[PDB]
Amino acid sequence: ALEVQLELLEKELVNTKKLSQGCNRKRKHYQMEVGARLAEAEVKFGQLLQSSIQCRVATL
Amino acid sequence: TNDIQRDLAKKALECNKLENRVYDLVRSSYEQRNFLIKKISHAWKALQTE
């Protein structure tokens, strides 16, 4: 009876293990989606930063 | 009191024989059953953290 009682607990350890890794798995994609979009924004940010300068340098 | 000393002798000798016969068979099955109980205490403790 004690062996039937034990195996049931470790089945729930697995069910929790799978859904825990499954939630983290969805988060990972979101992180990589936006982290790229932030990288896109910063590149464009640095382009203006120097573009606005090189316009003003020539105007003089 | 002497009637009990006969009983204490006769009965406890039977008890020690019954105990040591059981113990030889059941101390092994105790360890089997008791080491299995410790597995619930760890199977539970991990369950909560998960």
UniProtKB/Swiss-Prot annotation, chain A:
Function: Involved in mRNA splicing.
Signal peptide range: none
Family: Belongs to the SPF27 family.
Compartment(s) where it occurs, according to its Swiss-Prot or TrEMBL record: Nucleus
Full protein segment contained here: 126 to 185 of 187
Subunit structure of this chain's protein: Belongs to the 40S cdc5-associated complex (or cwf complex), a spliceosome sub-complex reminiscent of a late-stage spliceosome composed of the U2, U5 and U6 snRNAs and at least brr2, cdc5, cwf2/prp3, cwf3/syf1, cwf4/syf3, cwf5/ecm2, spp42/cwf6, cwf7/spf27, cwf8, cwf9, cwf10, cwf11, cwf12, prp45/cwf13, cwf14, cwf15, cwf16, cwf17, cwf18, cwf19, cwf20, cwf21, cwf22, cwf23, cwf24, cwf25, cwf26, cyp7/cwf27, cwf28, cwf29/ist3, lea1, msl1, prp5/cwf1, prp10, prp12/sap130, prp17, prp22, sap61, sap62, sap114, sap145, slu7, smb1, smd1, smd3, smf1, smg1 and syf2.
Protein's name in the database: Pre-mRNA-splicing factor cwf7
Swiss-Prot record, chain B:
Stated family: Belongs to the CEF1 family.
Designated name of the protein: Pre-mRNA-splicing factor cdc5
Cysteine disulfide partners in this protein: none
Subcellular location: Nucleus
Function of the protein: Involved in mRNA splicing and cell cycle control.
Quaternary structure and interacting proteins, as annotated: Belongs to the 40S cdc5-associated complex (or cwf complex), a spliceosome sub-complex reminiscent of a late-stage spliceosome composed of the U2, U5 and U6 snRNAs and at least brr2, cdc5, cwf2/prp3, cwf3/syf1, cwf4/syf3, cwf5/ecm2, spp42/cwf6, cwf7/spf27, cwf8, cwf9, cwf10, cwf11, cwf12, prp45/cwf13, cwf14, cwf15, cwf16, cwf17, cwf18, cwf19, cwf20, cwf21, cwf22, cwf23, cwf24, cwf25, cwf26, cyp7/cwf27, cwf28, cwf29/ist3, lea1, msl1, prp5/cwf1, prp10, prp12/sap130, prp17, prp22, sap61, sap62, sap114, sap145, slu7, smb1, smd1, smd3, smf1, smg1 and syf2. Interacts with sde2.
Taxonomic placement: Eukaryota, Fungi, Dikarya, Ascomycota, Taphrinomycotina
